[PDB]
Amino acid sequence: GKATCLGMDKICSPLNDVTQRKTQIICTIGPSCNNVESLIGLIDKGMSVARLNFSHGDHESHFKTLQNIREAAKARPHSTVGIMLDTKGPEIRTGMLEGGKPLKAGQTLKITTDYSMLGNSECISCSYSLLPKSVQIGSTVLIADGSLSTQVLEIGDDFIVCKVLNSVTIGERKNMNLPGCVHLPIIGDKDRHDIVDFALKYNLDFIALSFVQNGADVQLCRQIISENTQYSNGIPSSIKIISKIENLEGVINFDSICSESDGIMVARGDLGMEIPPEKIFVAQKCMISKCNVAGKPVVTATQMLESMIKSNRPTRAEMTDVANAVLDGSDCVMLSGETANGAFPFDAVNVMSRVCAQAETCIDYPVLYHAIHSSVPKPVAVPEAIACSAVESAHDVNAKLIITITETGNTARLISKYRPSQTIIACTAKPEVARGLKIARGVKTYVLNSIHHSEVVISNALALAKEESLIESGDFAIAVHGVKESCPGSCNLMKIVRCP
Amino acid sequence: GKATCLGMDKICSPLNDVTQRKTQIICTIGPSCNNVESLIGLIDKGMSVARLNFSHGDHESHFKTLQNIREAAKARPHSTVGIMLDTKGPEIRTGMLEGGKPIELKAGQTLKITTDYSMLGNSECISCSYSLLPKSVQIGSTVLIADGSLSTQVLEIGDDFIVCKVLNSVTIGERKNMNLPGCVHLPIIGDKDRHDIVDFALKYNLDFIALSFVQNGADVQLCRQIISENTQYSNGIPSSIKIISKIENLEGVINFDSICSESDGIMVARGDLGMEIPPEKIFVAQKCMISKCNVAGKPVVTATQMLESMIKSNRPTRAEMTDVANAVLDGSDCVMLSGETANGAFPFDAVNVMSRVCAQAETCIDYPVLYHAIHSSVPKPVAVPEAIACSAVESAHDVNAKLIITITETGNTARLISKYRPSQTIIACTAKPEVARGLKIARGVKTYVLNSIHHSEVVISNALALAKEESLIESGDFAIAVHGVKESCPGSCNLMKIVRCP
Amino acid sequence: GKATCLGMDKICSPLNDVTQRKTQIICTIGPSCNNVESLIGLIDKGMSVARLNFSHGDHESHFKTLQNIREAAKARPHSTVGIMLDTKGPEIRTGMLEGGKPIELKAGQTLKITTDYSMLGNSECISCSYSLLPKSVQIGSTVLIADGSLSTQVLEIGDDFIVCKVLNSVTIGERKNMNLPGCVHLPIIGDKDRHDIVDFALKYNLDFIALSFVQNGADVQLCRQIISENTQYSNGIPSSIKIISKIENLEGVINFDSICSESDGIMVARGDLGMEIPPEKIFVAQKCMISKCNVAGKPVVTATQMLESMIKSNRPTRAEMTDVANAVLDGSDCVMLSGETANGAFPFDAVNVMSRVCAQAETCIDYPVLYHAIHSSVPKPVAVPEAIACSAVESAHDVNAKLIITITETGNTARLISKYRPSQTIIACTAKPEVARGLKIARGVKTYVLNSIHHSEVVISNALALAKEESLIESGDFAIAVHGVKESCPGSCNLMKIVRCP
Amino acid sequence: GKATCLGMDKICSPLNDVTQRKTQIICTIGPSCNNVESLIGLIDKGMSVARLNFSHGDHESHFKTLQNIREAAKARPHSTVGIMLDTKGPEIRTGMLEGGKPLKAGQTLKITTDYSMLGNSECISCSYSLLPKSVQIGSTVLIADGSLSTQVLEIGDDFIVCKVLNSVTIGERKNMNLPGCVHLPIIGDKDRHDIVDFALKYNLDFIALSFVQNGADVQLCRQIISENTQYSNGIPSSIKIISKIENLEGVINFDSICSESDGIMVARGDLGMEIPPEKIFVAQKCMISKCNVAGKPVVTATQMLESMIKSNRPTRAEMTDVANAVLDGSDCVMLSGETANGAFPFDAVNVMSRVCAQAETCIDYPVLYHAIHSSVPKPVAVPEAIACSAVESAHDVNAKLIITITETGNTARLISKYRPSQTIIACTAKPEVARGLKIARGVKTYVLNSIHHSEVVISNALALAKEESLIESGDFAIAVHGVKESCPGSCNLMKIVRCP
Ligand SMILES: Nc1ncnc2c1ncn2[C@@H]1O[C@H](COP(=O)(O)OP(=O)(O)O)[C@@H](O)[C@H]1O
Ligand SMILES: [Cl-]
Ligand SMILES: [Cl-]
Ligand SMILES: [Cl-]
Ligand SMILES: [Cl-]
Ligand SMILES: [K+]
Ligand SMILES: [K+]
Ligand SMILES: [K+]
Ligand SMILES: [K+]
Ligand SMILES: [Mg+2]
Ligand SMILES: [Mg+2]
Ligand SMILES: [Mg+2]
Ligand SMILES: [Mg+2]
């Protein structure tokens, strides 16, 4: 480690201190940060994308929250905020309890498939009616992100009984996992409805597709998008499909899924089920690596600052956990309970940002570039060659910025794949192109009315980047754009400019 | 990363973990595992080294525990257990609480801290071992307690006390450590520490001195002077006891290169590097120091308490396992259990978990990349043993050997092989038990203690037989054997055999 | 080697050499190719640079030849021809023979050598230009004649002569060069050489001074002082004429690093490094000096006469072609024809052969290995032009471009691109002819001279059109274009375009 | 180039001077060095292998020469000399002339298929009776190692007429080449006879198989060896087959030929025919590289010191030519006319040796080892792993020698493949194993009565190597051998010993 020890040589000196975070941040929006004032708070602390978990909320609160995010967005024109719909999918939920939270290690616990039943510390409810017919005796049934472990003793007609293996006092519409076993579709009636009549209807940027198990699941979601063009004038939506790997089937079929998807989302808590706890990091590190090579953005969806749901400070363990997620090659990190129903959403996003910024300094960039550069077969398409020259030139002359003028975001995604030390600024006229880039590592975006006068776009971008403390006068920047006529002809070029 | 994805390809198949842990494990010995039956329990779950924290216990319990470890050692002749004395040094401690029970401090509350150690403290007022506490703190100063779990800010400074605003909701017990601003106001090696080194570590022939709060090369040179001067208990030959320098402050990090060079090993804990290094920067220091050690060929211990939840629980968290795995991937030779073994409800389960996670994380190491990295760091020409060490590791990989055997009087070649970080378990065959124990912080070194090492053919036969009974190798598998010949080689020489297990 | 075996896979298929030579060619101008029609002949077969060896000719023939080269230049506007003055320097020459005819010396015979230059010599007695010849030789000393083709051993030393035992059966002509023991007894830059530089090279605005027998940096600094002091013929601006230091003795080899640094290029001949370096060691020196030049980014010329057989024959030998190929593979920017063009029977055929062999040897270069080698030799950060140069060469490879175009007022970026040794022909577009001519020793640089370079879009259009008519590129093929923008970039900048040939 | 410039740094210093040649040397035996005193002369100057070109000589002179080589061999017990039979094969020869040597550019030259005809400067003879029926008009016919070029004007019943393209005065049973066109077998009646009743009969070491065109040609030669066991007690001879690539067919089929053969022989003069002169080096460099990877010894058979047939000194061009042959990766070089019918055989071998020694110092060994090491797939057989450790250890501790005790020469051939800077000494009880190793780069051999006491073999080898100025007291040597019992078991090992 060379870059990591240059980091330690700075820790041992009096001096300024310069770090700008490139890892994108997803914030799960809920009661704790639902209003316009909180969402502006999250944007300032470094929210890249707003996540709506459609496992929670109702028709009314979903619409209200969308309006609040977009009102908060208008109050910060220099920050672009992506909006992600996270599908319910074939999840299984506990039913509601009598009053509040109930369970002691060694006890038996009954689970009924009558959801309309107020549960206690002996009998609880289950949303899955085929629960007895999809379980054997000795089967492990995990509850609440796999915090409560149980073993099935008895299987009835419309119930099961489970031996509790943990002392814990948590409940109320928490998730249930049935490892190795679930006769539910990946994209059900509700999910096809939520995609068409919310994600497509209100022109969202990301569908986080829950429990993806093979390429065909992603092809199905793409078919729904191409078939339902009613809310986009008859042009298929450019909304991005982020496949969530939540089970061993997904891991087995990763190569196919990763290829079909626009991105990948992995959580340690989900893979916990069928894959032994001491093996999960193997799967997570490999899938992230595979994504880095494929040039597909990967999100570490792991809840990594759990202590910050109740505390204003995290633990040292939690910071090391985030740092390793970044060093593993994560494009993007995610806050769940810390933002959605926690006491310190702003502090949680702030901590996540600072740790990410620090972990990014320990990346040996040369090693990483030459690794990815040698993975792509030659010859390549012009944009990918321009992308490489941008990243190479930037390093060679110690530029602080890479600016790309784009109608699609193609060149920005390609530059992001080569993982430069410099912040990427994607200058575009199309807001959905700007929002769509907000899971890509290191991509800030500037939304303009025109991109036709390249000299002016680069001038205005350098000026705005100056006011965002990304660059100073005399510093180098790489500018990248196409020319349509008299280049001669059409072309793509790369300028090494100086910030005035 | 290709080794990581070969790991994932196995997760998705019908087969049956075929993995042997190479990362060494230190177990802190205390009330929870003090007896002979518990210590045998720790050996079976994979204890490499027994740690005596001389911040705790008294003259009687220290000696009693030493006898118990060595009785447990006799009950497992095929496992070698190193014994480490961890010095008190210039630490600062909280006093006793009211007839026990851990107090629940609430964020926002005030906490008084007195210089009268003989005072039974409560959830408003606690004690401090350091009499110059008020004269070494300003108002607004952060004072960290219990491996920096409780953060507090000083409101008032009295004659012989301070008052502190608690910044955390947290539950802390008795005689926990305190950290104060600066870069240690006491001697590194005091009267007690020079006494503990000479009249315990040297007197009872221990294997490791874990030197607390090392701040520069001179601190290690001082400890070496004490060892060389005090030869009374070792017939007049300086003890070969190994000095493991603990980096517990920014001064130590600044002076690491010097410390690392002087020391036989290095010990780092995330919990100690609290203060002066911001929490979000510590991993930078820890990863760099571990890397530097890997290059230098000095064993490095991650002393971080990483399975804290297992002090009260039978199972760890998924976060804690990922934390251990990353410590191993970062390049740790050695991991450490503190509260999990010393005063916890599940010592055996804690060591078991640590072992299994370590074994899994080791499969994700890209070995070729790591070997060629370290091989190209050493300048040529080299000493014969280091050339033999490289050929052992190369040959082992080339023919897919399961074992590297070294017959040694010193442990020199074993330490060298360990530095090149082979996938194969190293077995150091020796007639000197202190050579065997001394190797137990070196990544991947198991040891076989014999009465003689004179007949090389027999030592290798017996080692392959023992390795067979330890499920390290099977019949028909290749092993690399490495030893010297004293006469008629011709002359003296060092050689490397590619043998087959019968 | 994989590029070499891709070459062999093409030798075994139905297709049709698609290859353009990048190695530059120097042609020595003399009686055999002195007229305007011959020089146009040399341009068409691939002459990069015209060499005037001022060891030969007189004031009149030098001026006449210069006019002929420049008239030939006007008759081929799309080809740029550099003009090189090769200094006499401290050389020693044989005198004239009896009304001509080359003498046949037989191994074992004696040969007398007199200090009376005005003496018509025979196959027993020849002349010498150096009056201190007897006073700078011992008995048994080896005296080499005609680029070290005739070896002789001194038997007797007289007042104003020596007698030598011939060691070779060989046929030598008039006014050939002599080499004597030591590490040059004359000035490097004499009265004649300072005169030839100022009142010919500078006076008539030549492009290269080939500085004979350079022995250290100070020799090159002296030549630079003469150029900077004598600005009379260039309006008071120091001439941008390029100094190519010739390493012709062991002193030069010893001091190479210094010489190479001071010089704009380097010239080495196997024939010169005769004596003090054993014949079987010369390739060691030549390969090393060429390598050093490749790293330093200074153009190096293999001045070795490699097609000697083609002075009398229409065809070369297979040995001579392998010799040229290896000169190119060794990393030569530039090759040279001497007798083959200057006084030979087949100048056009000689240049033609040199071109075809060079083109073939260039296909066997593993380019990736060569780029990453030179890229990792330069420390970061770098100047903008060198970063643009790298991106040009990388982009060119990545998208399989056939051309790299650079618009330049200096030739700076062209020289930098040339240093990274791309597979693509470089076209340096410039308004200054002396910038175009100055680039003609740089590997792979063709040049296009325009009246203006103000409209970048038009320069690139016209360059692609001209490159199309020179069979360098076809419609639909990619080209890299590289130039500065002076205003509204924003500001000034340097950029790289990936364009398509129409 | 690092090693090449360390060579130049030594050229510029006062100091000792230490080089030992590893490239093996083949000497073609003929009238100029036919007697016992000359052959001892060649051994001292550095002859590795004696070549009998069976295109020349008769039954009597072949046998006489074999006796002389073996008498010369007995007079130098510390030097092992391999003996190579070079087959006539499907070659074509000019007939004899009237008295002495005759031809002017532009003239016509008649060629008759009546071999029993004394030829002049208008009409010459040809050994190939099907010459008119295997040529078209405008076909190029090369004579005397392709020195005389001609174009065919007319084709008769039993003749052709050719336009001479060169002024040259050379003749008398010289070779003829017909590029692109020859209805002769690779192994004819004479060649099967020469192999069985000379090479096998008198227990020679190498068959240099002329004009090999594919794997099947080598398989045929191996069939002859396995079928004819009469002169070797019924055990197939371990004689080595060196396939000569003399035409484009051979180059096309190289991979197959190289795989089947024990070695490869390439001459620039032979490939000159069908492959344009300016392309030959491409073929030669590639085939040598391919051999280096495959671990098969390759001989540069090119006549490279032609000037030394008449002169006591070579040209600077000729030395550079030899040096490049070595740097290209040649295991072995060859003298033809320089030894066979030249004025200075001893000087020719001496020059070849000195140049080879110098060119070997310019080899960057690390680059070459890691190149070949990464070409072999793992896992490997024990001997190849021992071979690598030998070469690695040798470099790491700067050993001067690698000693291998062998019954087969297997480990010596493997060590030779990894191209160490150190001389390899193959200690063996079997002389034909010693002789068989003499084309392998850097292998000297010591023939003993026993190899059973390993300690004594290594002692005696270090002592002999001391007397051969290969090593001094205190210098390191690598020793490599098998142990049959009590290793424990059987094994192969590598010792780092010190020369006493
Ligand atoms: N849209 C929402 N409406 C109400 N509560 C929400 C919403 N989104 C999240 N939450 C709350 O915040 C928590 C954040 O966790 P998250 O990962 O989104 O859900 P889950 O508990 O299903 O894993 C949820 O558990 C829930 O208590
Ligand atoms: Cl943005
Ligand atoms: Cl052990
Ligand atoms: Cl040109
Ligand atoms: Cl030999
Ligand atoms: K969901
Ligand atoms: K302690
Ligand atoms: K000259
Ligand atoms: K033959
Ligand atoms: Mg969740
Ligand atoms: Mg502790
Ligand atoms: Mg000359
Ligand atoms: Mg021949």
User: For residue B489, how many C-alpha atoms fall within 13 Å in the half-sphere facing its CB?
Assistant: 24
Cα distance between residue A265 and residue A218, in whole Å: 13
Q: Sign of dihedral through CA atoms B139, B140, B142, B143?
A: positive
- Are D462 and D358 in contact by the 8 Å Cβ rule? The answer is no
Token pair belonging to B193: 């520490």
Q: Which two tokens stand for residue A199?
A: 């994600």
Q: Is residue B4 classed as helix, strand or coil in its secondary structure?
A: helix
Q: Which residues of D425-440 are buried (b: 16+ CB within 10 A; e: fewer)?
A: bbbbbbebbbbbbbbb
Residues A191 and A155: beta-carbon distance below 8 Å: no
* Contacts of range D306-310, beta carbons closer than 8 Å, 24 or more positions apart: D306/C319, D306/D337, D306/D338, D308/D338, D308/D342, D308/D344, D308/D347, D308/D348, D308/D351, D309/D337, D309/D338, D309/D341, D309/D342, D309/D343, D310/C169, D310/D342, D310/D343
CATH 3.40.1380.20 location in chain B:
2-20+365-502
D110 φ/ψ angles, rounded to the nearest 5 degrees:
-85, 145
Ligand 1 nearest atom to the CA of residue A269, by list position: 23
Question: Is C70 annotated as ligand-binding?
Answer: no
CB count within 10 Å of CB A388 equals 24
Tokens of D355: 């140049």
CA C490 – CA A448 distance, rounded (Å): 18
Neighbours of B268 (CB within 10 A): 27
Q: Could you tell me which of B220, B224, B288, B223 has the C-alpha nearest to residue B253?
A: B288
B304 is catalytic: yes
Q: Do C391 and A389 touch (CB under 8 A)?
A: yes
For the record, the structure tokens of D127 come out as 């050994």
Contact between B11 and B21 (Cβ < 8 Å): no
Instruction: State the CATH architecture for C2-20+365-502.
Output: 3-Layer(aba) Sandwich (3.40)
Whose C-alpha lies nearest to ligand 1, atom 1?
Answer: A57
| CA torsion, ordered A423, A428, A432, A437, to nearest 10 deg | -20
Question: Strands A175-177, A92-93: parallel, antiparallel or unpaired by DSSP?
Answer: antiparallel
Q: How far is CA C448 from CA A360, C426, C430, C472, C485, in A?
A: 47, 10, 6, 13, 19
D93 annotated among ligand-binding-site residues: yes
Residue D427 pairs in a beta bridge with D405, D446
CA distance B18 to B360: 10
Residue of A nearest to B279 (CA): A316
| C99 to C58, C311, D334: CA distances (angstroms) | 19, 21, 45
Q: Say how far residue D239 (Cα) sits from the centre of its chain.
A: 14
How large is the angle between the packed helices B384-398 and B412-419, nearest 10 degrees? 50
Which of D127, D94, D142 shows the shortest CA–CA distance to D272?
Answer: D142
3-state secondary structure of D264: strand
Tell me how crowded residue C186 is: count the other CB atoms within 10 A of its CB: 12
Chain B, nearest residue to D459 by Cα = B490
Provide, as residue numbers in chain C, all residues whose Cβ is less than 8 Å from the Cβ of A493.
495-498
Question: Reduced to 3 states, what is the DSSP secondary structure of residue A125?
Answer: strand
Residues of chain D found within 8 Å of residue B497, distances taken between Cβ atoms: 483, 487, 491-493
Looking at all shown ligands, the one closest to residue B177's CA atom is 11
Tally Cβ neighbours within 10 Å of residue A55. 14
**Structure letter (DSSP) for residue B318:** H
H helix or E strand, kind and range, residue A5: helix A3-11
Kindly state the tokens that stand for D315: 């040209």
Looking at the complex, report in whole angstroms how far the Cα of residue A294 sits from the nearest Cα belonging to chain C.
18
Q: Is residue A488 reached through a cis peptide bond, with omega within 30 degrees of 0 on the bond before it?
A: yes
Given an 8 Å threshold on Cβ–Cβ distance, is B5 in contact with A248?
A: no
Question: Which residue does chain C place closest to D363, by CA atoms?
Answer: C284
- Taking the centre of ligand 6 as the mean of its atom positions, its distance from the CA of residue A164, in whole angstroms, is 26
User: Ligand 3: distance of its center to the CA of A14 in Å?
Assistant: 46
Instruction: Enumerate the CATH 3.20.20.60 domain ranges in chain C, comma separated.
Output: 21-90+187-364
Distances (CA, A) of D205 to B269, D80, D87: 68, 11, 14
How far is it, in rounded angstroms, from Cα D42 to Cα D80? 12
Nearest chain C residue (CA) to A473: C491
Distance CA C89, CA C55 (A): 8
Q: How many residues does the structure list for chain D?
A: 500
In the chain, the amino acid numbered B293 is: C
CATH number of C91-186: 2.40.33.10
Structure tokens at D484: 């049959």
Which candidate in B417, B498, B501 is best for mutational testing of the D interface (most D CBs within 10 A)?
B498
- The whole-angstrom separation of Cα C38 and Cα C346 is 11
Which positions in chain D touch C250 (Cβ < 8 Å)? 11-12
Letter for the amino acid at D65? T
Superfamily of B21-90+187-364 according to CATH: Phosphoenolpyruvate-binding domains (3.20.20.60)
CA D266 and chain centroid, separation: 9
Rounded to whole angstroms, how far apart are CA atoms D70 and B351? Answer: 74
Q: Which of C5, C279, C315 sits opposite D286 (nearest CB)?
A: C5
A475 shares contact with chain C (CB less than 8 Å): no
Are D85 and D193 in contact by the 8 Å Cβ rule? The answer is no
3-state secondary structure C245-269: EEECCHHHHHCHHHHHHHCCEEEEC
Q: Which CATH architecture has domain A2-20+363-500?
A: 3-Layer(aba) Sandwich (3.40)
Q: Is B51 annotated as a binding residue?
A: yes
Residue A157, both tokens: 């007609």
8 Å CB contact between A403 and A461:
yes
Check residue C239 and report its DSSP letter.
Answer: P
List the one residue out of B108, B127, B26 whose CA is nearest residue B342: B26
Q: Which of C398, C417, C420 to mutate to test binding with chain A, by most A CBs within 10 Å of its CB?
A: C398
Are B499 and B478 in contact, with CB atoms under 8 Å apart?
Answer: yes
- Which helix (H) or strand (E) element contains residue D428? strand D423-428
Ligand 1 shell residues, CB under 6 Å: A 28, 30-31, 53, 55-57, 61, 175, 336-337, 340-341
Contact C500 A489 (CB under 8 A): yes
Cα of C24 to nearest chain A Cα, Å: 28
Tell me whether residue D488 is exposed, middle or buried, using C-beta atoms within 10 angstroms of its C-beta: 0 to 12, 13 to 18, 19 or more.
buried
Determine the Cα–Cα distance for residues D126 and D136; give it in Å rounded to an integer. 17
Q: Which of residues 361-390 of C touch A (CB under 8 A)?
A: 380-384, 386-388, 390
Q: Which residues of C are catalytic?
A: 51, 93, 246, 304
The rounded distance, in Å, linking the Cα atoms of D168 and D101 is: 10
Q: Could you give the CA distance from residue D74 to residue D90 in angstroms, rounded to a whole number?
A: 35
Which pair of structure tokens corresponds to residue B168? 């955390």
β-strands B24-28, D123-125: how paired?
unpaired
Query: Could you say which DSSP state residue D232 is in?
Result: G
> CB C387 to CB A386 under 8 A?
no
For residue D229 the two structure tokens come to: 């066991």
- Name beta bridge partners: A491: A483
Question: Which regions of chain D carry the CATH code 2.40.33.10?
Answer: 91-184
**B384-398 and B367-375 helices cross at what angle (nearest 10)?**
160
The angle subtended at Cα A324 by Cα A321 and Cα A325, nearest 5°, is 85
Q: Which residues of chain B are within 8 Å of residue D369 when distances are taken between CB atoms?
A: none
CATH fit for domain D91-184, picks 2.40.33.10, 3.40.50.10420, 1.10.1060.10, 3.40.50.11540: 2.40.33.10
How big is the CA angle at A185 (ends A184 and A191), to the nearest 5 degrees? 115
For domain A21-90+185-362, which architecture applies? Answer: Alpha-Beta Barrel (3.20)
Chains that touch D (3 or more CB pairs under 8 A): B, C
Q: Is D53 annotated as a binding residue?
A: yes
Tell the burial category of C450 from Cβ atoms under 10 Å away from its Cβ (0-12, 13-18, 19+).
Answer: middle
Cβ proximity of C206 and C54 under 8 Å: no
Instruction: Select the residue of B279, B280, B360 nearest A279 (Cβ to Cβ).
Output: B360
